[PDB]
Paper text:
Accordingly, it has been characterized from a number of bacterial sources, including Brevundimonas diminuta (Bd; formerly Pseudomonas diminuta), Flavobacterium spp. and Agrobacterium radiobacter. The present study focuses on Bd_PTE, a dimeric metallohydrolase that has a (β/α)8 TIM-barrel fold with two Zn2+ ions embedded in the active site. Carbon dioxide reacts with the side chain of Lys169 to form a carbamate functional group within the active site, which serves as a bridging ligand to the α-Zn2+ and β-Zn2+ ions, both of which are required for full catalytic activity. The buried α-Zn2+ ion is ligated to the protein via direct interactions with His55, His57 and Asp301, and the exposed β-Zn2+ ion interacts with His201 and His230.
The crystals of tagged C23 (C23_2, C23_3, C23_4 and C23_5) and C23M (C23M_1 and C23M_2) grew from AS and glycerol, with one monomer in space group P43212, such that the canonical dimer is generated by crystallographic symmetry. In the case of the PTE variants, it was essential to confirm the identity of the metal ions in the active site. Accordingly, the X-ray data for C23M_1 crystallized from AS and glycerol were collected at the zinc absorption-edge wavelength (λ = 1.2724 Å) on beamline ID23-1 at the ESRF from a crystal that diffracted to 1.38 Å resolution, showing a peak corresponding to the zinc absorption edge. Notably, when AS and glycerol are used as precipitants, the binding of OP ligands displaces the cyclic compounds X3B or X3T initially observed in the apo structures.
Author numbering:
A (entry chain A), B (entry chain A): 35 to 364
C-alpha cells in the first residue's frame, strides 16, 4: 500500500502517471563527486534536471522511476533535491547494471542479496532513502557474475515484494535467460519487467515473455539516430529504427491482449558520462522534449492510430502502480 | 619544498621514514559509503587502521603514501581521520588503477589530464585535499585506455612536478612499455617509480629500468603464500616466493649501484574488498606486523646480510623525500 520514493513513502494513488525507466544522470559510482566539472557543474546538472522534470510534470508526469544503480553512479541526495524542486516523485533503485566494480564482481549470491536488501529495507548509503525497485542487466548470455546478480535480485524481491526491472540486449533475446534464472529462484513473472524490449521487432520473443506473465518494458521510445548523418557513436547507442516503429510495439502488444503488461518510458537522462563526450547534446537535439516525449508525442500518436484514452491511462497509471506496489504476486 | 598530505603541506624533513606504496583500504569507488557493513563497520575499519598505523609509527614509520586511486575507492576523508588519530602523515594519490568505470574508460587523454590535475592542483572531490602522487596500472600489454592513462599521468606530472608510481604485472616486464610511453611524452624517469618490481627475479629487466633512471618499487615484501596449504586465491594474489627472496632484491640493486633508486614498501591494507571475501584475514595471518613489517623484519634482515644502517636510512628516508618533493628533474 506504500511505494518508497526519495522523499519517503507515497500511496499508490499519489504515484499517478509514472515513467518506469528513466535516469537523472547516467554516470559511474563516485564520478559526480570526484569530477562535477564534467557536467559543467553539479548546480548546472541540478538546474537542467529540474527544468526537464518541471516540463514533464506540466505534460502530466507525476512520478519517475530512476533505474540508476550503484554502478550508474546513482546519487540519491541529487534525486531528492531534484524531486523536491520539481514536484515529481522519484523512485530510486538498487541492483547492479553492466559496470560493477571489482568489489561487487567478487561477491557471492548471498552477499549481493544482503546488499540489495540493505538498500531496500534500511537505506542507501547513510541517507535513509530506500529503493523501490531492483535493476539488473545482461548484454547477451549472462556472465557468471550476472547470473548471481539476477538470483540475488530474485531473492531480494521475494523477501520484500519490490519488483525487478532489467536491461537487455533485446536482439539476443536476453529476456529468455533472465526469465529462466528468475523462475529457478521462484520469482513470479508479475514482479519482473523485461526492459529495452522496444529495441527489437521480434514478436515471438516479446509474446513469449508476455505469455508467461512478464511485464514488457517499451522504455526507449525516443531513442533513434535516424537523420543523424555519419555519427557512428550515436547510431550504435540509439539504433536506426524510428520512434514511431518503437511506439507501434505498444499498439502491437495491446492488440495481442497484453495491455495490462506494458510499461512505457523514455530512458532519458539529464547527464550522461558513461558514454562518449557530448552524447547528451546529441540526444537532446534528437528529442528536445526529453522525458515529456511520452505524454507529448507518443500518447497523441497512439490515439491517432486508434488506441483509446482509457487504454493509455491504464498503461501509464494503472500498470506502474500495480508493478511498483510491493507484493509477491501482482 | 612541500609535499601535499591529507592534512596539508609538509616539509621534506617532516616526511621522515616513508613507506611509498600502501593502502588504508583496497576497495572500489563509492563502495565503503554504500556497504560499510562489508568491513564490519566504517568505525571498525578506522579503528583497525589507526591501531596498525600506530604500531608502524612505534617501529619508526613517519609517512605512508596511500596509492589508492579513485577506482580503488580512495576516501581522503577516511585517510585524514586515520592520519590525525595515528600521528602518521599520509600522501594521497590521483590516477587510475586496473578497475576504471565506464565514465573514466571513455575519456580522452586531455580529459584524463584535466581530472588528474584537478586532484593535484585543486582538490579531491570537495575536500580541498590535494594528491601528492599519480598512480597508474597495466597488467601485461597496455589496453588502449591504459595508454591514455599513462600519457595523462605524464602530462600531469610535467605540469606539477608530482611523481608517478605504477602497478605492473612484473612477469610480463610491463615497466618497459610504461617507460616507453612516459618517455614519448617527455617525462623524466627520475619522476617515475615502476612498482611491484619485487614480483620478479629478472635482473635484466630491473637493471634495464634502473639504468635509464627509473625508481624501482620493491613494494610487496611480505606478500607470500608459502605455508598456506591449498589456498588457491591467496596463492594467486601473493605468489610462492618468500619474503626473504623479495627482500634480497633490495640488496641486489644496492650491489649493482642503484641504492638511490630503490623504494621499499609493504603494499599492505587494513580493508580489502576488491578481492575474495576474508582475504584481509588471510593476509593478516601471513604478516601480523602489517605495515611495520619493513622496519621490524626487513631492515634487520638486510643488516644481517651486510647492508649498512646508512644505506638503509638512505633508502627509507632520503629516496622517498627526493621522489615525492615536486620537481621536473630529481
Ligand atoms: C480494444 C483495444 C482498445 C481499443 C481498448 C480501449 C483502449 C484502446 C485499445
Ligand atoms: C657498499 C654498499 C654499502 C655497504 C654501503 C653502505 C650501506 C650498505 C651498503
Ligand atoms: O542502459 C541505459 O538504459 C542506461 C543508461 C543509458 C542508456 C542506456
Ligand atoms: O594492486 C594492489 O597493490 C592493490 C591493492 C592490492 C593489491 C595489490
Ligand atoms: Zn539499460
Ligand atoms: Zn536506462
Ligand atoms: Zn598494484
Ligand atoms: Zn597497491
Amino acid at each position: 500500500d506504500r511505494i518508497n520514493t526519495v522523499r519517503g513513502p507515497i500511496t499508490i494513488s499519489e504515484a499517478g502517471f509514472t515513467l518506469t525507466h528513466e535516469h537523472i544522470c547516467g554516470s559511474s559510482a563516485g564520478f559526480l563527486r570526484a569530477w562535477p566539472e564534467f557536467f559543467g557543474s553539479r548546480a548546472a546538472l541540478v538546474e537542467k534536471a529540474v527544468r526537464g522534470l518541471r516540463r514533464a510534470r506540466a505534460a502530466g508526469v507525476r512520478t519517475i522511476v530512476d533505474v540508476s544503480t550503484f554502478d550508474i553512479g546513482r546519487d540519491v541526495s541529487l534525486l531528492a533535491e531534484v524531486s523536491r524542486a520539481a514536484d515529481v516523485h522519484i523512485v530510486a533503485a538498487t541492483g547492479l547494471w553492466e559496470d560493477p566494480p571489482l568489489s561487487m564482481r567478487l561477491r557471492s549470491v548471498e552477499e549481493l542479496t544482503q546488499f540489495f536488501l540493505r538498500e531496500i529495507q534500511y537505506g542507501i548509503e547513510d541517507t535513509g532513502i530506500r529503493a523501490g525497485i531492483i535493476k539488473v542487466a545482461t548484454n547477451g548470455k549472462a556472465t557468471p557474475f550476472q547470473e548471481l546478480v539476477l538470483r540475488a535480485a530474485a531473492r531480494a524481491s521475494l523477501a520484500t515484494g519490490v519488483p525487478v526491472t532489467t536491461h537487455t540486449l533485446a536482439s539476443q533475446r536476453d529476456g529468455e535467460q533472465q526469465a529462466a534464472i528468475f523462475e529457478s529462484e521462484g520469482l513470479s513473472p508479475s514482479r519482473v519487467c523485461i526492459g529495452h524490449s522496444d529495441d527489437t521487432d521480434d514478436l515471438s520473443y516479446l509474446t513469449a515473455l508476455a505469455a508467461r506473465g512478464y511485464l514488457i518494458g517499451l522504455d526507449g521510445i525516443p531513442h533513434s539516430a535516424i537523420g543523424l548523418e555519419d555519427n557512428a557513436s550515436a547510431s550504435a547507442l540509439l539504433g536506426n529504427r524510428s520512434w514511431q516503429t518503437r511506439a507501434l510495439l505498444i499498439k502491437a502488444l495491446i492488440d495481442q491482449g497484453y495491455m495490462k503488461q506494458i510499461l512505457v518510458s523514455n530512458d532519458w537522462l539529464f547527464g550522461f558520462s558513461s558514454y562518449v563526450t557530448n552524447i547528451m547534446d546529441v540526444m537532446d537535439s534528437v528529442n528536445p522534449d526529453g522525458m515529456a516525449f511520452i505524454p507529448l508525442r507518443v500518447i497523441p500518436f497512439l490515439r491517432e492510430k486508434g488506441v483509446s484514452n482509457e487504454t493509455l491511462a491504464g498503461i501509464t497509471v494503472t500498470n506502474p502502480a500495480r508493478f511498483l506496489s510491493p507484493t509477491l504476486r501482482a
